Amino acid sequence: IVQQQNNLLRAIEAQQHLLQLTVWGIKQLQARILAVERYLKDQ
Amino acid sequence: IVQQQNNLLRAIEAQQHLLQLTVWGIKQLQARILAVERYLKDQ
Amino acid sequence: IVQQQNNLLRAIEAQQHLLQLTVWGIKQLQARILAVERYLKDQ
Amino acid sequence: MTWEEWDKKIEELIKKSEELIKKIEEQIKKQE
Amino acid sequence: MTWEEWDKKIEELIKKSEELIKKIEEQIKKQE
Amino acid sequence: MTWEEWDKKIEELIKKSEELIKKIEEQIKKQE
C-alpha cells in the first residue's frame, strides 16, 4: 500500500507541472490583451 | 503512514486553491477579449 | 485506510477534469486574441 | 462547447472537489 | 517558450496523469 | 482582486505545493 502512495504522489507531481503551465499561459494572454487595450486607447 | 496521507491531502488542498485562482483569471480574460471584440465591431 | 486512498484518488480525478477544462479555455482565448491582433494589423 | 456550459462544469467539479476534501479531512480526525 | 511547445508539454502531462490514475484505480480493485 | 495580488497568491501556493511534495517524497525514502 506504500506502492499506492508513491503512485498517488506521482499523479500529484504531474498535476503540479500542468498547473505551472496554465499559469504561464494566463500570464501571456493577460499581457497580450493589455497591449491591445492600450493600442485602441492610444488611437 | 497516516502522517503521509495528511500530507498528500495538504498538497491536494494547495492545488485546489491554485485551480480556483486560474479559473478566476480565465474568466477575467474572457470578459476583456469580449469587450474588445465588441468594440471593434461597433466601430 | 484503503477507504482513504479511494477518496484521495477521487479528489485527484476531479482535479484532473478541472485542469482539462482550464486548458480548453486557455486555447480558446489564445485563438481569439490572435484573431484580434491580426485584424488590427491588417487594417 | 459554450462558455456558459464551461461555467456550469467548472462549478460542479469545484463543489465536488470541496466535498471530497471534507470527507478525507474527517476520516483522519476520526483517528488522529 | 512557444505555444506549440506549450501544446506538446500539456498533452504529454495529461496522458501521463491519465495513465497514473488507471494504475492507482487498478491496485485498489486488486484488493477492494 | 488585482492581477499583482493574483501573482502573489499564485507564487505562494506554488512554493507551498512544492515544499509539500518534497516532504512526502522523503517520508517514502525513509522506508522504501
Numbering used by the authors:
A (entry chain A), B (entry chain A), C (entry chain A): 3 to 45
D (entry chain B), E (entry chain B), F (entry chain B): 41 to 72
Article sentences:
After the binding of the gp120 to the cellular receptors, gp41 undergoes conformation changes after fusion peptide (FP) inserts into the target cell membrane, exposing N-terminal heptad repeat (NHR) trimer, and forming the six-helix bundle (6-HB) structure. Peptides derived from the HIV-1 gp41 CHR are potent HIV fusion inhibitors, which specifically interact with the viral gp41 NHR to form heterogeneous 6-HB to prevent fusogenic gp41 core formation. Our previous studies have shown that AP1 and AP2, artificial peptides with non-native protein sequences, could form coiled-coil structure to interact with gp41 NHR and inhibit HIV-1 Env-mediated cell-cell fusion. To elucidate the molecular determinants of these artificial peptides, we successfully solved all three complex structures of AP1/AP2/AP3 peptides binding with gp41 NHR.
Here we designed a new artificial peptide, AP3, by adding Met and Thr to the N-terminus of AP2. However, a similar strategy failed on the crystallization of AP3; therefore, we decided to cocrystallize the synthetic peptide N45 and AP3 peptide, and eventually the complex crystals were obtained. Interestingly, the crystals of three different inhibitors belong to three distinctive space groups: P21 for N36-L6-AP1, R32 for N36-L6-AP2, and P63 for N45/AP3. As expected, the N-terminal Met and Thr of AP3 forms a hook-like structure. The hydrophobic methionine side chain of M41 accommodates the groove between AP3 and NHR helices, capping the hydrophobic pocket. This interaction leads to a series of conformational changes. The main chain of AP3 at W43 moves 1.91 Å closer to NHR compared to AP2. The side chain of W43 in AP3 flips around 90 degrees and is buried deeper than that of AP2. The side chain of E44 turns back to interact to D47, but the E45 side chain turns back from K48 and interacts with T42. Therefore, this M-T hook structure could further stabilize the binding between AP3 and NHR target.
